[PDB]
Design a protein around this ligand. Structure first.
Ligand SMILES: [Zn+2]
Ligand SMILES: [Zn+2]
Length: 768
């Protein structure tokens, strides 16, 4: 009869938002906070179990950063077999959110209910009780809301169609269903609201009854909210209030003004109240994925210059750290949000940094006899590059792999565009190299190709090209590079291509577009081309009208079917209006016409000589594609040709021999180990051989393999009986930076590479 408040994620390069798990004495579990990108992967890394959990209390404003991990989480918690699941929030917008995920989220046998809480509504459980409060950024009280009662009705119906009781038909693709092409309700009466929660606990039980402290969970996106937050909480009775949790946004600044809000909650009736601060200039930037970081470090020991080491630094808030204690050690970068020190009545032993191993436990107590029982356990997870080197990689004894050459003298060096050659010829960063589920060791797919273009005058600029981007792609980016380096990358990001509608390929695209906007915002003539299946353009539109309408004025979407190398262009479905969703559908004749104006305009802008696609043998509306880049003004013959499979079953007829043919570089899917050939054919992916076979008939001058399914990090088992028709090749690993010219210099290391992860083999074999 006790509760532990165990933090899952804190603000960090990989994990942008806080998430908190409250766990009962006998295992009843509830999430509070935000289910952002990487938040489902961080559960598996740390071996946390989600048995009994069916309640997610979503706080704050809901943009893509705050919920991009949620589609993933739902389809993972379903695949794990969870019967029910309830999403809580204080605004009807939540149903519009899940509704935007029609074409990519579908699971039967899960009872997914959305619970839209009124302003002061209580949710009583057997064990817990949870009252909500909705702060409204600018206004006071919520009147009509956002959607009318008909609009709310149809949105709930879409959610029901997404998570039905019984299986529909065995060959059912949400992509290829006409009834999901609905016109979602317009966001005109939309409101900016932070949802917060008060958590009370059920008393324990002739004798006399013991009570529990009350936890408040606040979520403040930015400063403009604070005026509304003081207006809503000034007269809030802090009687039995034991702790307040502050989920403070990036945009909120740590100044006298914030602490005038915090000061409201200085006292309770039986003593003082402890404060827990989650903020990105306060919480440390620890490594979130140690599996990945170790795997990356071992790989850097073999081929240095092809990996960056995970950064762990950030600027902290001097104002804060000085006003309490552990002031900064003078090497680490500080920030000073104001001239004067912090004006606040809070004591140092009653305020704490929200961090990963910093758990809090509440025991019950005799109301007015004794002080309220609350115990803040744990310390920040310390970490040392040198100490993990000597333990985990030094004993492997690789050629010239030592604590200096791998770590120390590499620690301050970006291996992206630095050298002479690297400027004027192609690079590929493989930011994710995995199938379906984010694993401990390989994140979901993303492939970023730098294709340079040299000018008449002879100076050379990059054309960065995104080829899919699953959950937390912008995370894995922010982690490898410094902030100074990310700006240049997004300023040169000219195109985003999606192969198909599976969630492992697109769930980071919105984050990517948000970041692209951050950097290209200010150039009125800066645009981004987005070539995707047409259903994903529905999403982008219905999402960005919610989150940032302005970005839609810079997106120049083509559509994959308008590049198909086929006389016949498949006709897309006509959008069925809102009214007529209730209980054949006409196709759109105009959708058959290639948007040739915009294609020609892409070619001129990005210097593409030819872009074309073909159909992948996988999903409906899947695609494989091939792009030919002219490399300078003063040369006709200087073309570079890239090709990228979707999740295709090997397609040697239409892709290898036709569109892909004679390509300088192929990037192909190699999901399955050869041993699982009969599973690959059902799941519609190539095996490592079937991939190499495609690369062969194509005549790929070079090859890269990605989208690996694996129980553990290994180099794939090459078949001795098959040739590599390809002057150079390599196997992708998360955060890897090849130069196109130097793709082959992995082959030299192939024998040693296999040895490197025997530690991770024996570990994952603990179940076998
Ligand atoms: Zn996939
Ligand atoms: Zn797929």
């Amino acid at each position: 009869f006790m509760f532990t408040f165990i933090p899952i994620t804190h603000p960090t390069s990989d994990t942008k938002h806080p998430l908190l798990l409250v766990q009962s004495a006998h295992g009843e579990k509830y999430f509070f906070g935000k289910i952002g990108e990487g938040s489902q992967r961080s559960l598996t890394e740390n071996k946390i179990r989600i048995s009994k959990l069916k309640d997610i209390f979503l706080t704050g404003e809901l943009n893509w950063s705050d919920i991009g991990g949620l589609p993933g989480m739902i389809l993972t918690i379903a695949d794990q077999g969870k019967s029910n699941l309830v999403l809580h929030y204080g605004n009807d917008i939540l149903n519009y959110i899940v509704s935007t995920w029609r074409y990519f989220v579908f699971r039967f046998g899960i009872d997914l209910n959305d619970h839209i809480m009124k302003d002061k509504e209580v949710y009583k459980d057997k064990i817990i009780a949870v009252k909500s409060f909705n702060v409204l950024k600018n206004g006071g009280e919520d009147r009509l809301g956002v959607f009318d009662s008909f609009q709310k009705g149809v949105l709930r119906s879409i959610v029901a169609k997404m998570f039905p009781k019984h299986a529909p038909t065995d060959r059912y693709d949400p992509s290829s269903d006409p009834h999901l092409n609905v016109e979602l309700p317009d966001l005109d009466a939309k409101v900016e609201v932070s949802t917060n929660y008060e958590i009370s606990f059920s008393p324990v039980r002739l004798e006399n009854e013991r009570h529990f402290a009350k936890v408040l969970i606040l979520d403040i996106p930015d400063d403009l909210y604070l005026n509304a937050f003081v207006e809503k909480f000034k007269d809030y009775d802090c009687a039995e209030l034991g702790m307040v949790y502050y989920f403070l946004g990036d945009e909120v600044t740590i100044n006298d003004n914030l602490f005038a809000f915090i000061d409201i909650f200085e006292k309770n009736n039986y003593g003082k109240v402890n404060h827990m601060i989650s903020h990105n200039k306060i919480s440390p930037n620890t490594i979130s994925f140690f599996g990945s970081a170790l795997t990356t470090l071992k790989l850097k020991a073999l081929q240095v210059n092809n990996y960056n080491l995970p950064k762990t630094d950030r600027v902290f808030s001097k104002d804060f750290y000085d006003r309490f204690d552990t002031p900064l050690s003078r090497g680490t970068s500080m920030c000073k949000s104001q001239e004067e020190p912090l004006n606040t009545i809070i004591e140092k032993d009653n305020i704490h940094i929200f961090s990963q191993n910093k758990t809090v436990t509440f025991e019950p107590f005799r109301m007015n006899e004794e002080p309220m029982k609350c115990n803040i356990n744990g310390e920040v997870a310390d970490f040392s590059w040198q100490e993990i080197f000597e333990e985990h990689v030094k004993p492997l004894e690789f050629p010239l792999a030592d604590v200096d050459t791998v770590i120390n003298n590499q620690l301050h060096v970006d291996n992206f565009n630095n050298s002479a050659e690297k400027k004027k010829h192609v690079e590929i960063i493989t930011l994710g190299t995995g199938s379906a589920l984010p694993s401990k060791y390989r994140n979901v797919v993303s492939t970023l190709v730098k294709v340079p273009f040299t000018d008449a005058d002879g100076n050379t600029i990059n054309r960065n090209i995104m080829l899919d981007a699953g959950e937390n792609t912008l995370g894995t980016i922010h982690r490898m590079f410094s902030q100074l380096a990310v700006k240049s990358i997004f300023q040169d990001l000219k195109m985003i291509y999606l192969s198909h509608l599976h969630a492992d390929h697109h769930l980071g695209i919105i984050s990517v577009l948000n970041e692209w906007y951050k950097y290209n915002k200010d150039d009125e003539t800066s645009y981004i081309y987005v070539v995707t299946p047409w259903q994903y353009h529905k999403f982008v539109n219905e999402w960005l009208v919610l989150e940032n309408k302005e970005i839609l004025k810079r997106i120049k979407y083509i559509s994959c079917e308008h590049f198909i190398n086929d006389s016949f262009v498949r006709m897309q479905t006509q959008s069925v209006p809102l009214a007529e969703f209730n209980e054949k559908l006409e196709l759109d004749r105009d959708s058959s016409y290639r948007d040739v104006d915009l294609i020609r305009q892409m070619y001129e802008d990005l210097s593409i000589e030819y872009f074309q696609t073909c159909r992948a043998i996988h999903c409906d509306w899947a695609y494989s594609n091939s792009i030919t880049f002219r490399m300078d003004e003063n040369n006709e013959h200087n073309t570079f040709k890239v090709s990228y499979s979707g999740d295709t079953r090997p397609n040697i007829e239409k892709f290898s021999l036709e569109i892909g043919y004679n390509s300088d570089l192929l990037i192909h899917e190699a999901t399955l180990e050869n041993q699982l050939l009969e599973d690959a054919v059902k799941k519609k992916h190539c095996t490592i051989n079937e991939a190499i076979g495609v690369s062969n008939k194509m005549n790929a001058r070079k090859l890269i393999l990605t989208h690996f399914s694996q129980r553990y990090p290994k180099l794939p088992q090459l078949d001795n009986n098959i040739d590599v028709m390809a002057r150079e090749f390599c196997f992708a690993f998360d955060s890897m930076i090849v130069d196109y010219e130097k793709i082959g210099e992995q082959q030299r290391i192939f024998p040693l590479l296999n040895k490197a992860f025997v530690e991770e083999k024996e570990e994952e074999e603990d179940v076998d």
